[PDB]
Each structure stands twice: as structure tokens, then as C-alpha cells.
């Protein structure tokens, strides 16, 4: 057969001289795009993403490559694995992170520390970027290492700087050009060398933690993901077919930090910029916190079901946020039939999540902040099929539950204790991203946390 429609490519440049959502109106919801010397099928709109990821879930359950980090991951780890490797790691990961209320108690604890830290500034202007990277890194440190770090620790901070520098280098023009031609640019200096060095330095720290965990291991009292994985690693020691080896341990742990920090942190950074721009919304979240939780006890995950306005605001922050606008690349596991077109085995697929989050079928005002998008006539929370910020299908975000608990407990715990102000008036606040790509990031801003 033939691949979906699209612009006619060129020998090596592919469709370079024709550069996803731009091409949609001419070719359609599903089209073929050549990113140099490789073809990609793009899925635009809620229904075409749902058709592929939900209706043909096993076929679209493959994972593609991100050329700038593929030299680190090399198909290992829970995010970038495929086939049996992926199934075994994902199954083990859901099971272990589910075995350790404790993720909620640790998020509550991390929110109590954040309040304590914001209270020391005493209403001073600060850039919350570093503290939001720190609380989301501390939830994973707690899960994978069985402990958290102090916000003023220089070991912790040196690893964050180096790590968050990598996300900025990944979602950049330099790295975007690398994706189009990495078989040629790998031989020259570029951001790929810095991304490589920064993630190798974090892998070295993970490797040290794993040997320290093994050296202090109590097999009858596992305390975290690494301990559990080391016990599965000694169980499967005899089987050479086992996926539970050292290379998958380091790159699974890296995968959880790579995925579990940047995006949640930015969601919180973006949310506080919207709460600065729309104080009537922040005031209303505080009114709802005051009625359900009050001012003495801290927020708990059970409070969310009784706080639909706050819950709707958080949905709208993720929707308008649109942090992963093209999704994480997929691949077809076989030669698939899709809308009359034939997608050959191993072809890369891009579920353009942004086109679902801004779909005018499901959102009255797609480009405007409207918490009413998730509230019905009775003031109750309603969800629609356009809301897919964590994607869907078999590759659906493994930390969806963690991420959603973090946003609830950090937004409400901060707002119960603090009000916010900025030198920029609400009407002059801009929400333009700082660096687009695999991970959206908004512009840096200043904010005061005023104790109540
Ligand atoms: C607001 C925060 C977050 C957002 C918007 C988000 C979004 C996404 C998206 C769009 C994908 C791609 C799914 C696909 O390939 O179709 C994904 C995958 C993934 N997420 Fe997240 N995520 C968030 C937080 C987290 C957290 C906190 C964790 C870890 C605790 C995590 C772990 C993962 C993993 C391991 C994958 C790969 C799943 C697989 O390939 O099987 N994420 N996420
Ligand atoms: Cl290349 C890439 C891979 C995974 C993520 C991710 C998963 N969940 C949150 N972030 C982001 C970017």
C-alpha cells in the first residue's frame, strides 16, 4: 500500500524546506512528514490520536528515538524500551511504586517543608524555578533512593543545575537540528555532547547509590525502588533472558528523574504565573480551600473530590500549559492499517497532544484560561476526551497518579498558607514559552509568597 498523505520530500533534507500543525490544514488530520532521512506519521486531533493510541493500542505501543538522548538510554530503561523489555520494566515499575498513601504522605511531608522554606523568605521577590525543581526531584529521590535532600544542600543543587541544564539543551534549536541529522552531526561539537556529559554524570551518581544500597541492603525490609530491583536482580540471577540487569537499573532510575521532574515542575511554575495573571481565580481557590480544608490541618488527597473548582483550575493549568505538545515519539509494532493508509513496521508516529488540548470540539475557548472547561451546570468536575496531557493507551504516563497528586497537594498547601504578588501587574503578564520542543517551559518571573 501507501503511507498517509504529505508534502513531497527531497533527497537528504526531507521536508526541511517545508518546515507539524502548519501542514494539517492542507493534507489532513493524519499525514507523512520526512524529517531529513527518516519518515514520520503525524496524528492531529483528538479522534485520530484516540483511534491510534486507544483503538489500536498494541499496534501503536512502540517507542521511537530522541536522537540527542539515545546514546545514553540506547533502548534501555522504562521510557525508551520496546517489546518484552518495556513490558517487564513497566509492569515491575507500576507494581513497586504502587507498593510504597505513602507517596501521598511523602508529598504532604515535602509540601510541609516547602511551606517552612517559603516562610523563611518573609515575602521577598524570588524565582520559584529552583524550588519547584527541588520538590519534584525530592519526590523521586524519596521513591528511588528512600530519602529526600535539604533545599540548601550543594550536592543536591549541583546535580539539579547540571540536570535541568540538560532539559534546556534538549528542547533547543541546536538539539532540534540534531534530530533531523544526527548520523552526521554526532561527529561534531554540539549540545548532544553536553547532554551526554550531564546525563553520564547523573548515571555515575545513580551507580554509586546502587552500590551503596547493595552494601547496606536488608532483603527482609526493602526501602525503595533500587532495593526492590536488587532483590528481583538476585532472584533472576540464573536466567540470562532476564531484563533485570544493571544497565536497566541505572537507565530506569534515570528515566524516572528525566520524566518525573521537568514537566511537573514546569506545570507548577506555569500554574503560579496564571495565578498571578488571574487573582480572582486564586482568590476563589483559597475560598474553596477555606471551606473544605480550613486553615489548621494540611490538604489531603481526599479533599480534592470535594474541591471541583480547584480541581478544574489544575486541569486547565495542564491543558493550557501543554508541556509535551508533540507527545513522546511512538512507533508501530507491525505493518498497520490506519484510515486506508499502510504504516510500515517500525515507522515513527507523533501523537500531537497539543491539538487535542486545544480542540474546539471539546474546549469552548481553546487559547484562553477557562476553568469552566471542566465544570458542569451543577459546579461539578466534568472531563472530556480532549484532555490527554499524559497521552493515553498502553504507553500512558506511568507517573500520572503521582503527578496529579503533586499538583493538588502543592498548589493547595502553598495557597492555604500564602498569597502571591509580583512587580508585574496582572494585565501586563505574558505567558509566552522560553524554549519549545519535547518539553515546553514558560519565561522566568518574580513572585512573593505572603504568609497569611
Ligand atoms: C504534569 C506532569 C507530567 C506530564 C504532563 C506527563 C506527560 C507524559 C506524556 C505525554 C508521556 C508520553 C506517553 C506516550 O508515550 O504516549 C509520558 C510518559 C511517561 N511518564 Fe510522564 N508526565 C508527567 C509526570 C511524570 C511523573 C511524575 C513520572 C514518574 C513518577 C512520569 C513518568 C513517565 C514514564 C516512565 C513515561 C514513559 C511511559 C512508557 O513509555 O511506557 N511522568 N508522560
Ligand atoms: Cl524525550 C522525553 C521523554 C519523556 C518525557 C516525560 C515523560 N513524562 C514526563 N516527561 C519528556 C521528554
UniProtKB/Swiss-Prot annotation:
Summarize the protein's role.
Cytochromes P450 are a group of heme-thiolate monooxygenases. In liver microsomes, this enzyme is involved in an NADPH-dependent electron transport pathway. It oxidizes a variety of structurally unrelated compounds, including steroids, fatty acids, and xenobiotics. In the epoxidation of arachidonic acid it has a unique preference for the 5,6-olefin.
Q: Which GO terms describe its cellular component?
A: endoplasmic reticulum membrane
Which lineage do the record's taxonomy fields give for this organism? Eukaryota, Metazoa, Chordata, Craniata, Vertebrata
For biological process, the GO terms are:
epoxygenase P450 pathway; xenobiotic metabolic process
State the CDD domains in the record: CYP2B (cd20672)
- Put simply, this protein is called Cytochrome P450 2B4
- Report the membrane topology from the UniProt record: Peripheral membrane protein
Give the Phosphoserine positions (modified residues). Answer: 93
This entry's comment on induction and repression of expression is: By phenobarbital.
Q: Where is the protein localized?
A: Endoplasmic reticulum membrane; Microsome membrane
Q: Which domain of life is it from?
A: Eukaryota
Query: Which EC number(s) are documented for this chain?
Result: 1.14.14.1
Q: Which cofactor does it need?
A: heme
Protein family membership: Belongs to the cytochrome P450 family.
> Keyword annotations for this protein?
Endoplasmic reticulum, Heme, Iron, Membrane, Metal-binding, Microsome, Monooxygenase, Oxidoreductase, Phosphoprotein
Amino acid at each position: 500500500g501507501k503511507l498517509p498523505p504529505g508534502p513531497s520530500p527531497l533527497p537528504v533534507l526531507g521536508n526541511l524546506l517545508q518546515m507539524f500543525l502548519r501542514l494539517r490544514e492542507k493534507y489532513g488530520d493524519v499525514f507523512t512528514v520526512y524529517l531529513g532521512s527518516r519518515p514520520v506519521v503525524v496524528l492531529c486531533g483528538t479522534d485520530a490520536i484516540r483511534e491510534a493510541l486507544v483503538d489500536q493500542a498494541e499496534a501503536f505501543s512502540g517507542r521511537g528515538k530522541i536522537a540527542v538522548v539515545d546514546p545514553i538510554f540506547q533502548g534501555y530503561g522504562v521510557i525508551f524500551a520496546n517489546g518484552e523489555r518495556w513490558r517487564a520494566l513497566r509492569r515491575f515499575s507500576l507494581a513497586t511504586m504502587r507498593d510504597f498513601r505513602s507517596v501521598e504522605e511523602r508529598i504532604q511531608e515535602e509540601a510541609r517543608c516547602l511551606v517552612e522554606e517559603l516562610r523563611k523568605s518573609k515575602g521577598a521577590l524570588l524565582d520559584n524555578t529552583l524550588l519547584f525543581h527541588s520538590i519534584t526531584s525530592n519526590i523521586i529521590c524519596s521513591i528511588v533512593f528512600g530519602k529526600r535532600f535539604d533545599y540548601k544542600d550543594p550536592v543536591f543543587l549541583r546535580l539539579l543545575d547540571l540536570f535541568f541544564q540538560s532539559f534546556s539543551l534538549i528542547s533547543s534549536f541546536s538539539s532540534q537540528v540534531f534530530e533531523l541529522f544526527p548520523g552526521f552531526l554526532k561527529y561534531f561539537p554540539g549540545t548532544h555532547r553536553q547532554i551526554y556529559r550531564n546525563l553520564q554524570e547523573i548515571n555515575t551518581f545513580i551507580g554509586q547509590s546502587v552500590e551503596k544500597h547493595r552494601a547496606t541492603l536488608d532483603p527482609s525490609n526493602p526501602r525503595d525502588f533500587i532495593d526492590v530491583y536488587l532483590l528481583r536482580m538476585e532472584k533472576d540471577k540464573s536466567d540470562p533472558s532476564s531484563e533485570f540487569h544493571h544497565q536497566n537499573l541505572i537507565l530506569t532510575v534515570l528515566s524516572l528523574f528525566f520524566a518525573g521532574t521537568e514537566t511537573t515542575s514546569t506545570t507548577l511554575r506555569y500554574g503560579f504565573l496564571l495565578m498571578l495573571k488571574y487573582p480572582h481565580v486564586t482568590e476563589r481557590v483559597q475560598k474553596e480551600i477555606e471551606q473544605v480544608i480550613g486553615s489548621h490541618r494540611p490538604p489531603a488527597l481526599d479533599d480534592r473530590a470535594k474541591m471541583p473548582y480547584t480541581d478544574a483550575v489544575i486541569h486547565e493549568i495542564q491543558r493550557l500549559g501543554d508541556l509535551i505538545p508533540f507527545g513522546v515519539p511512538h512507533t508501530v509494532t507491525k505493518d498497520t492499517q490506519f484510515r486506508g493508509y499502510v504504516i510500515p513496521k517500525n515507522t515513527e508516529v507523533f501523537p500531537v497532544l497539543s491539538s487535542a488540548l486545544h480542540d474546539p470540539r471539546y474546549f469552548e475557548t481553546p487559547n484562553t484560561f477557562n476553568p469552566g472547561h471542566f465544570l458542569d451546570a451543577n459546579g461539578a468536575l466534568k472531563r472530556n476526551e480532549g484532555f490527554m496531557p499524559h497521552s493515553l493507551g498502553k504507553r500512558i504516563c506511568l507517573g500520572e497518579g503521582i503527578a496529579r497528586t503533586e499538583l493538588f497537594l502543592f498548589f493547595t498547601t502553598i495557597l492555604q498558607n500564602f498569597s502571591i504578588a509580583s512587580p508585574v501587574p496582572p494585565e501586563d503578564i505574558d505567558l509566552t514559552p522560553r524554549e519549545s520542543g519535547v518539553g515546553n517551559v514558560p519565561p522566568s518571573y518574580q513572585i512573593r509568597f505572603l504568609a497569611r
